[model samples]
Target chain A: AMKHIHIIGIGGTFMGGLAAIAKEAGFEVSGCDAKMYPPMSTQLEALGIDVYEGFDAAQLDEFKADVYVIGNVAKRGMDVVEAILNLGLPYISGPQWLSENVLHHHWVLGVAGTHGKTTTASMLAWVLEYAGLAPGFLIGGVPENFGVSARLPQTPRQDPNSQSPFFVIEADEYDTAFFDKRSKFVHYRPRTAVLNNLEFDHADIFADLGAIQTQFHYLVRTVPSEGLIVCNGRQQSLQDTLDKGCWTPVEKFGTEHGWQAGEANADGSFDVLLDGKTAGRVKWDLMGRHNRMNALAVIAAARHVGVDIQTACEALGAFKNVKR
Target chain B: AMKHIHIIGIGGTFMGGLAAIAKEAGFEVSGCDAKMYPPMSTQLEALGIDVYEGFDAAQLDEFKADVYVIGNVAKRGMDVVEAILNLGLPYISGPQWLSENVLHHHWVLGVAGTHGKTTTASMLAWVLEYAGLAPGFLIGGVPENFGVSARLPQTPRQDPNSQSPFFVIEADEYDTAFFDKRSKFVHYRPRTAVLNNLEFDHADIFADLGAIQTQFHYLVRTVPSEGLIVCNGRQQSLQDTLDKGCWTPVEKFGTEHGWQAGEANADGSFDVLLDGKTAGRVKWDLMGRHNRMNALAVIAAARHVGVDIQTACEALGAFKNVKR
Candidate 1:
């Protein structure tokens, strides 16, 4: 009763994980890769898949897969990619596939930035999950609550009457594909967009920070008035960009606004407080100011996702720094 | 009832997050920074803490903070760090704080690699949480599950009994602290050590891949007999390193063993099998061979963490790529 989906370059990290997700959803899934190795191969195998080591047109004949989920790495000459395109089979890029199948039914929380995008998205997703929203998410980084990068809401019926509507996506400023130069976040059209402090990164594609800003503007333009835009109050660039915004409601968060910042204790730990209430604390496992920005972004986005400030603060109270 | 903690150079990313985590744990936290900016200030403010922009010995008197958690950027001349060390107060690095406090009661799934460490750690944490284990974790990258990089267990008590045994740590091969050059993982002492793959990286500190390997060897040495060492079977270097004899038990996972690998379907997806059983299919949004390697590592590690291979595979079926 489920659909059959095929993935190209399925050995890749994000794509491979997606293949696993599709299979879990009762889809008959298949995939191929130019190179097959550990982790990915083991992952596919663990899901009962045997991925071909190399690209071969003939390999496509065996499974008779229904739809092709093209991996981002699939280039022009790859056999599987060419076959899918030339044969006129139904195919979609990884993002497109998610939009059509997974995110369509969920309330999307999209976090975008040059640096803190992953962390911001992760925080929003975590707050939602911890608060019992049980929101679905397609994150770039792993969310500790779910233990996998992507998830589809579970329903009682095979075709359920209702499904979890919330989704958290790590919206990126990078162009969608080789053919599509626009930002990928445009496709998500997120109801809540967390614009963390923006800076210039990804020198390979973007010419400068302004180029990235333009892309961000595109995302902001998509937010309807019913939605919200959470901007970093401390970042001049983010503030500057949002100032020009004509659509969507916006809120500002940061230290100057009397939001919680890092406060150290005598025992080498730090407490996160918002307006005199405890949000979370860390005991010296994590370091760096960049993380502070990430936390503020999380706070704003979490509020936008319907997590009350108090509960969100309580959940944050348990946050620990993973990196040194 | 909470402890008093102090942080030095609180502006760094990892340390800042840790400060926030400590605050969340009901600790009275304060911090000193030489350069105060938006994100960190905003984060601190959101947590309801006042930031003393510059370090002055006089400021320490007001808080009467108990311990000093030093960020990596703290040098000898920093007033707060020097005062803490000179005062002979209890002081520790970020990693030390995690090991001694947050990680003490958690069952750790430690992931190490030059790349994919964040992603793999993220996946393992998400899976544990998804399975309703209520796992606690400190990951390098923000996982979509908990929506943040770190969290304390839900148990009311801070003692070992109250902590969630399940933790997924993003273990780095970097030096523990300026004073301690040992591999950071030695302190974590994980029950499950996942070596996703080996590659040369961190040119800033490490001399070469051999140096990284030596650090890995140090990590393997710390694994107890009951603990599990999940290595990529397809990676010759990882296999070669583990072949040298380790006290802990090891499990090899990849395409070569075929025990946890999958075959590609016609449309390029894969029929995932776990220990040779068909689990599900997946169609993802990401690309590149490295990701597949990441998935395999997640599958093996998740199995060790108590998620059945089939269930892990099923979760993978719903994964969508985190667009970057």
Candidate 2:
């Protein structure tokens, strides 16, 4: 018998993507949400998952899922959530469910920051795929290369011995769910964590930048000492988050002292530098200083899983940014 | 195929008790400890569990177990822990492992405080058992009634319809592992949480009383609104902890406004008062005022699982305090 899961607030990118992956993993998946629109609606339908409209408690009896995975959109007063609580049903946040079911089985590479999370995660996934790793991934946006936002790792056709034990994620620092106040990314428990940059965002939930940093510090505590933390050298906020306490080995990007990118050439290609020395040149058409920094992060994160810096640089040459 | 788990600190009461429960649950259990002594040592050997001496990493290869469950005694520099980390093997703290494998499957009743956690949890478990609700339990001390610190729930032979979905635990506020700084009780996620009492202790880890209160607040956060929080109404520290935030319905003990105990009788019995009214009288040999308060906490917690106050009071008559 297939394990069943009913997702609440399943129309959003994160939850919808999880629904798709759960369906692909052979789970009996169903969902309910008030606002359902295109792209996500089409995606969930195509995946063959039953989607119910509104947050009515009556829909709960239809599936009687083994567990309810709640998204942040499901609040305390919502009919479905209130019913679930009153019945004392098993429930968990989307990130927590993913961690326990999926991420725990693989080496997670998490890209976290205030900006460019989707792009960096897309780039990292593409690099690993181009290297024949067949990495599993869950991004907030649809990358052009894969044509989907989330997927399970595909078995390598070449050799079983060469299989990859990797999963890449666009980790967000947003609150997990109404019941859980911890940041979503804290549950990822990534072996390779990318701190792209930090800024005062999500003012609706976080009191200040310090409050967000405290959550990030919790993320730092989960990484094992054997893991690698790829941090942005230019971001003082990120450095401050690390200064709170860091046991894992760190490799800073976007600075001359660590992994950095030189100015773009006439065709938009740039030289990848390691400790101020040119390690390889990325001949990609993606233009902007931010994308260059993101590529550096991708390369550093990829290298942790045995992908060479040159292989990652070459893969980025064919990288196309996600469809907005 | 039987799943295997190697316990790293099996001589201590907590881990040894867990080893016993895991063995009874049909797992292939083994352990390693430095200070091997009876009664724990005798208990483990009587259960037919292979015990290895010292924290030597060499013994790990002999088992090649699925995962390692480390106790707080196995610190950062322990050879076995270092090997597990260096090899990137799956490992978790005993509290985390138990939460995932055992507590998640049942309605957990957690007893947390600076004092009387073991006694209160034992009392709660005994009351549930006396009410014909066989409960799985893990306590730090060997209760005189149970004859051991831990055991899985025995199926009720009278009727399967009268089965229990309860597991009582002695929830501790100590750090989970050297790697995880959160309090162990935070991982328990109890549906019926009891805040027995609070005072500034564990000076080695906590900077001040406020720090411990923050950890307790995290524990409070995990409880659902539909669940019950049995608190100590007499303690300002507990009130301060709840002031940080609380969503669950609270029933405070040890005060006139809630569940309180009257003066002890000549036979060491006492009247159990509820909101300034005598609900029932507890006739027991446990003489201390603290034990009276512990009984109050136990009664309120048992009520959450449908055990009547009078039944719990009657059960206390046969309650024998655990061995020191």
Candidate 3:
């Protein structure tokens, strides 16, 4: 018998993405949100997942789900959440459920840090897809290359049994749920991680920069020696994280001695360099030094999965940026 | 070039075992401890590792090693630890270093709880050895099956480069180091873990049982979905830990419905039972209901790594208890 899952607050990007992946994994999926809107609303409809309009206790009994995945948006006052507690139904946060169900089996490539997580994750997912690696991914925003915010790993050619061993995820530093207060990325356990940049944010959840750095340190500890951590060499904060304790091999970008990007031309094309030697060229319409740095991380992470640098660069040439 | 590592408080069982494994892994290992004693001192000498007798700042100048591994016994105001800080030399905890260097690359089987950690770990190591899996192991006490308390993965025939993809460790709940206060087992990240039993202890560090259970929850968070958590079903504390959150598949021992053991006969043999059916018989001189319960967990965890029930039972017949 197929197990069923009912999602609370599933209209948002992260939870909606999980619903789609769950459906693909053969679980009967249903969800509820206060208000549903496109493109996620349309995406759920296309997948045949039942979406209730509001948080009501009756939905749980109607669905008879084997488990409940509670999004961060769900609060104690919500009727479904209260019912979940009083009934003693099994529940978990979105990120933790994803790690236990989906990401655990795949070679996870996580893009983290204060900025550019979504953009970098999208690029890495596209690069793997372009290389025919068929990476499963869940990003905050939709990449134009992929119609939805998330999906299971399958070829663009749509082979029925296609399953990829690689997965790219936008690893957020935000607190997981009402019960679990640790940063979401700690649950990811990525083999290839991109520390795009580090800066202080989420003051609501963390006390200071050091508090966030501790979480990053926990994330670094989970990586295996066989893995690689692509970080920004220019950021002392990220360097401070590695200093705390790092067991995995690390490659730093955005520095002269490490992986770097040459100055962008008027056409937004740049040469990717390692040790100041040209490795490959990426020509894309995405402008800014930040995006170029993101490209360098994507190239390094893709290489970890056996994708060649030239092919990664080629993948970026056709890469389209997410909606602004 | 092979790297060098200096261990602080190298004469202790945990650090000494780490030093042995480091030497086996081709690192230049040296250390300083206040006192040295036999078994560990003899083992280090057999490995040809230099063991300095005191914790002085001068030892740093002598070693000039790449990194320092600080055992918990090396505390604040210690001259070597002070030097490690003032000189800005890289350092890490022994358990963290072991995780990065050795356990990260292998299928780790960890036995963690308030009791039976060492004996269960030794039993698991011996069972794998008898099955010819050639598991690397680090236990708190020396088992008679292998004279040494720890070793790298190799067969009894001593074939070089015969690195088995498995490692067994006695995961502890004590704090890591002066800088890192998380439980030691949190660093292990085991693929197959045995929750032998949980009770209130470590009163000096943890405020209550909940604090320790929080650490156990963190350990549970690290196990992948593909991994199995063999837990003690009879203990409410272990169940409370799982109630907080559990992502991996769990198999409970010590209950009528789960894995169990028939009452021991006068000959010190018992029948391994599962779901009221006899699985196999264990004939050993090890006495007590606790040893029988430990044997149940060992059998279940061994089965996770492809060892059969009959083979595991046969291995326990030859299993010898660690020195009291």
Candidate 4:
């Protein structure tokens, strides 16, 4: 009768991130993979979570977790998968486990883009941290500010009297798992969903950019009327997703209509504009107009959740490179 | 066959302000008061608007303006009021005139409070102007910068391609008129509403603070979930108003829970902190904690409509006294 979270195919960075967040949320977290590899495996061991080698049927019986979080690598016929189906243990996909256990209670700020998801999410987490929000975030790779890729927002802020915390999730459009083939982001029900960009990249899963646009459309549909959908104004794919229709209000970045970025300076500094007004000057070491767009998005989402865009821009001072 | 806006009881500050806006909106604005008073009477004449000396049903027949905007002072069965009714001419209250003629399409930023309505609305209008929003406003009294209160947001920005201008309205909680008893704000479906403070004041109309709270709660209900309600955090009346329920998200200032004001310095400048982090410093010759609260509300509401609070603070340099 012990409460635990057992992750399958735990060597993958995605599952490893989940493992860390579950542990931080005070669940007994454990997982197994066919063979352990460095980085993710080392990160899990460092967190003091149990990691079993190979998919042996005996491992599930021994671990006996309260729930099994199935990863993409675990298929219908795998011995570990069969052990759970045979025993009828409570099982869910990683994204499902994340939503039901964590995202449901918080204001979700999702950062999804083909190119800069990790960078944008990390920046957003840091801004919220600077604003004293203590946001929870799950990035595929670690950021320098938070050594772990996934962070549970400070539990103290969860007190009923206090404001709800924000969960910054990398709303990746990749297929979730063999059992559930919808994009991983469809599970996130985010209040402030940031669509950084969309393009044809996952050739193995998606046939073309339009197929991915439909999945992004699905993600937008899940956002409530009370929520916001932050999309890139410069990108045609974001417009394509919205052209299918969305009930929620949309805030755009890199567009003439909404938030726009000024030209980059020689010293890696620039200005961010909101609705054509200079919101603030940005002078971070992180260069290029793309990061500016990311910062614009983070601030816009932060604004939706009650933090002023000015404060969010100031918070970006603490932003640094994500740990490779 | 002339198209014009005829004002009844147009010599008072509120009605005079409405007259100025109607005139600027290119309506052939004309009006009659019981007896024209200096300042307003002169101001109307100066603006080249035809001002009649007193109310005569004959004036309504002779002027033959397309519609009549009745001031709150005009009671039922009064000669001018009866003239419009008896003839079955089109007529609406001042608040109704504002909503249908100007604010319906633009995003409305309403500043409501017992004390600082004019000053706060002027500040909001100025800030939006600073942000190049070309906002229309109907402040009860004139601010030194604009010379006259209640100018239409420059009509030039009405192009469909350009961003819709914001109309910063002085959202008085007072009853609309003899024909319409609902609070003035009920007619204005504000996208971003500011509840500066609440207390028992209008004993002639409202029985108690609870009655006012109920009206404000109604205003809160009108805001779409996609919109925002900016509130004062420390006031129990605000909490009581919200206790009735609201579907939209709220941003608060003036307490430990949300946006707070730092200590005021000798120069009438104070730092505005968001969740304890200094957002920016706001300074003006206007003294007292009330103005600070006003600035906070303006910034919070401006934040709701895509302008940054820091930029708002900088724009406060352009803020001035609404001719007391």
Candidate 5:
């Protein structure tokens, strides 16, 4: 389907990548940015797209074409933004756009946390990609393995296999948009979500650890009955969030309890024993206890995505860390 | 050949991971930590290795270890450390051990700089892994994609293919040991090296950027005739380093005097070009010019490994930034 998608503040990294994705999907894509530099300017130029450097009401003349996708950075007063609101243009946040366009086609694996969300999402996505699943992904950071942050949905054989359903997303608990203060993960409605670890962060927006926990509670509420919420067993905050009764199947992943996990050999990599069967070992170059938690989450989410637990384990063994 | 290895102060993240790697390589590994916590304690126990809560000379005597691997943080007069040194036991630094044992069979690609070393190394390692090169690596930070920081060389066939010739190492310029004040990169002797935008760092050691540059100059001078050097074209200090010259083939990456090497896409990523052919693109989530420079250096170094320029491009297309 050729969708007409317009992005606002399209120069930001995440939004810009989404714009590229929209364009790659055969959507008629255009946007505006407040500040545009060499690489981004060069990229938009190469794509032959129109990008207005500053907010201007006249930029909205092109909005007659399609759906407006607003970036997280876009605010209310900008001329183009005000025009979109005034016209009641069909606009949505980037996460919402992704949910509507990309998430529906795939089994969504959402990674949410104060830290390690990017790494966890990247691990899940890379595992799927390595297994030849070619699962589409939208991560917050560049996976060292893949080198890029987001990819359009594509089949393993590059055929029209819409049924090849799997999308790995780095789900953040940050407010969705200027108009929406709810957590962004609510829009993803993930089938498999990995709460790597929860702590107080985003001090600019969130007041305390409890505020972040409430956001996580919202994310837990969003998971479907068939979905799985894999959490860090070691975190008290995660326990607090789960205390708010969840409708979905829940699993705890941690060092001391739940699906007991550890790193084999002497190298603090990844090793898991689910119900006492050697689930798998991760041979990646990532470091820290936070990462081991991320790996455990991936192990559970990969199984939910239709990859056999053992097969997922094997994939983990083959996994490598991102480059310098 | 199974070796007996003992790690002093192994509870630290990086050192602990290295200890795990030694065990995975079929070594009888044991470690000591000053403090024991949930994750690291759980990690060591899960690996089926003994963990002593405090440094004990008695524990060292009981282990009857063949070699001692010292971590960077260990100070003089610790029990296991003093015992090992007094016995005249063969000892090696963590990086040296990695280079000699884990990276010996692989084509070593080293990334070094004052900043962005972790991200850049992660990206380059990720590109190779994503391209199906199955490269081995030891990255500093947990790349969202790989999930862990260190790994042993293994493939799916279960065949111990120790001959797989590719590794991505974080070549830190930190002084090797109290005795050997030289940079750690000197020991790795990388086949492909990247001096990613250097400046004065490590205020505790080295007088200024000049001292650091002198160390880098040594590294550049050591590159074999067949080896390659990739440097930041935009850095004035980098220019000064290159001006001194060496025998190895050198390529300048990034922007310089109207010659733009990479362009950032609408999504805030970069597409690297060598003369007109696209080498790779970095879809990063982080902001600032420093990251763009880091991406360019990664692309050039990746090419030096066996990855074809086009394949490098494809891998870069798949990269996503980990959340900032």
Candidate 6:
């Protein structure tokens, strides 16, 4: 099959970053959106992906790609979406295409929440990279720690200098596409997933807090029985999502049970505890409980895939994320 | 200043057991109930506790105790309850008294479920005993592993031969007293709590699952931030309970993430994993997934309190529970 993929509404940060990753994964990637801005257009230009100014139903025949990933921005009654439906072309959501192409055979670590998805995913991807896992990742913003926001996992089996099979995906719980009402994260059948926190989010697509929880339930069910689920230990919405019935192994942080960040010292050193036993202290400039929770969650997730939790924490001490 | 205690409705298993422990704890224990049957009555008489045949208003003057521990069966308008209320005597529910006295300074491990509270609590108390913790505990049924189902934690100091400070309480999420509709477990303040499984139980007390979940939420709130909440990872009601909001650390068993039991062998031997790491093998005659979950919850709980989980497994291998 041709590794030719095209994305609709690719100007958004998440979709734009995804387009770059697909190109790096050796796929022929190109995209079209309502507007093509400077940074994203420049980034796509550097990645060699052709970016178009607007949508037209005729482009389906012109691009002639193997798959079309529709973003949430492309809704019902859109010209291109209607043309693709009539033409019966193969199409998927951004998350679906990424899952079918890149995340299927790897240990997909999906970080999701009402907020902090990109931040947490960025931190997790960096932790994997620093550990020599060279994790493939797709994060919204450019992570200052790693110059690139997304890439393929430079696994040792594929490359001698690389290490493990890991992919850090910033999973969004938004509706997948115009045709598919399922949350985007459902497609990324992750082995280890994280619910950073839960709140009423995506006001446009999701009706209420419970509606988003229903989507999260779908993502929780996708994890295998032995797979790990890193959850927000103190967030009620997150707990409610797991309450619906979680089959996978669950590790909770941001509270007492799994991993807890002790007092943030004046010198920027903080102690981390697993249930209560001191795993180690991380010396980094990051402050606030949310950041520690994000750090703790990734380490717990890393532990599930055979990385030493202590080693994961040790690497985080040197982590300098983007622009605070 | 007399350290005297009187119990109202002392015929039930939990109340009778509490009477025995209070008697052993050097308190002047006296009680009244509508009826006193064998085993529990005989056991109490042997401990020098006077069990009355029926309730009466005159007991207030005869037994002006320091505190009156009321059981659920003693509701409003009952002779003794009315007398206690009219006479302005200090009174508390069975769970309340335990929290105020026994569990006040101990590292409490609470085991709760619709069923198996007695069986699982029996196993956990025995595990602590074999580990030399000599845990103070109270269970509903008589256990074959130990002569008495309930006893005080006998731990005084930290030493090789001495038992550690801990109380393994059979935390029931049932109503406390007629006046206090809150679940009995709300008072335990358990550092390590377990919800072995959840079911639609105590129909007369709870309107539906959500009502019971509300009570469980109260119990969850009592645990400190550093406390451990070992829950049935597969129980939807239990998951919903934590979803409301929890501050303590939580560990889930009977599914993935925290602890999981491998399939049973021909001889009833099975392996256990703590977050995928081989914690140990449990070689016992116990059958069914429920027993494995019971074992896993306690081991995960024991790990929280600094007990070597492998040693806990070894101790359990020799454990022989009372006939179900």
* Two-way lDDT contest, 2 vs 4, winner: 2
For candidate 6, report its TM-score. 0.49
- C-alpha lDDT of all candidate models, in order: 0.66, 0.87, 0.85, 0.78, 0.70, 0.78
Model 2: per-residue Cα lDDT over B150-194, one tens digit each: 887777545686645789999998877765557889777799999
Better of 2 and 6 by TM-score: 2
Docking class of 3: incorrect
Question: In candidate 2, what are the lDDT values of residues A176-231, reduced to their tens digit?
Answer: 87655668987787899999999997888887999889888888877777889999
Give DockQ for candidates 1 onward, in order. 0.01, 0.27, 0.02, 0.01, 0.01, 0.01
TM-score of chain B of each: 0.86, 0.96, 0.96, 0.91, 0.87, 0.94
For all the models shown, what interface RMSD does each have? 23.7, 3.6, 13.9, 24.5, 27.4, 26.7
Q: Candidate 2: where is the Cα deviation over 4 Å?
A: A75-77, A85-88, A155-164, A178-182, A200-227, A236-249, A284-287, A306-308, B74-79, B85-88, B155-164, B178-181, B201-226, B240-248, B265-267
lDDT of 1 by residue, A191-216 (tens): 78888778765855546566566567
For model 4, residues B1-324, the per-residue Cα lDDT tens digits are 436888887877788888777777777888887777677778889988887777678897678887788887876446666556434455667987877667776778888877778888888888887877788888777777786777776633336356546788888888776545458897677878888888665855546577578678767755655678888887888898888777668888888768888898988789989888988998778788888888888888887777788888999966877455
Q: What's the CA error at residue A13 for candidate 6, in Å?
A: 52
lDDT of 5 at B259: 17
Q: What is the DockQ of candidate 4?
A: 0.01
Candidate 3 has an lDDT of 0.85
In model 6, what are the clashing residue pairs, if there are any? A239-B243, A240-B243, A243-B239, A249-B256, A249-B257, A250-B257, A257-B249, B136-B153
lDDT by residue (tens digit), candidate 4, A1-324: 337888888886778888888887788988888778676667887899988888888886674677788898886546777666444455667997888678867778898879899898888888887777777888878888876788787643436356447889989888676545568987777878899988788888887898798778778755766678889988887897899877678989988779988888888777888778888876688876788888888888888888787788788877888876
**Candidate 6 residue spans exceeding 4 A from truth:** A1-324, B156-163
Best by DockQ: 2
Q: Candidate 3's residue-wise lDDT over A1-324, tens digit each?
A: 988988888887788888989999998999899777776788799899988989888987788988899888876667777677545456778887898788877778999989988889999999999988888999998888998888887753445476677889999898787655568897787889899898776764455567688889878866766678999998888998889887678999988888999988989899999999999999989999889989999999999998999999999999997666
lDDT digits (tens) for residues A1-324 of candidate 5: 476777787875577667767777778788877878877788777777778777887977644756778887776556777666445455667887877677755577888888877777877987787767887777765676675667775677545554357778778888777644557777776778888888776787887888788778767654655568888888788888888667567888875546766654566555677765666666655567666667788878877766676676676666666421
TM-score of chain A of 6: 0.93
Estimate the TM-score of every prediction.
0.47, 0.89, 0.54, 0.49, 0.48, 0.49
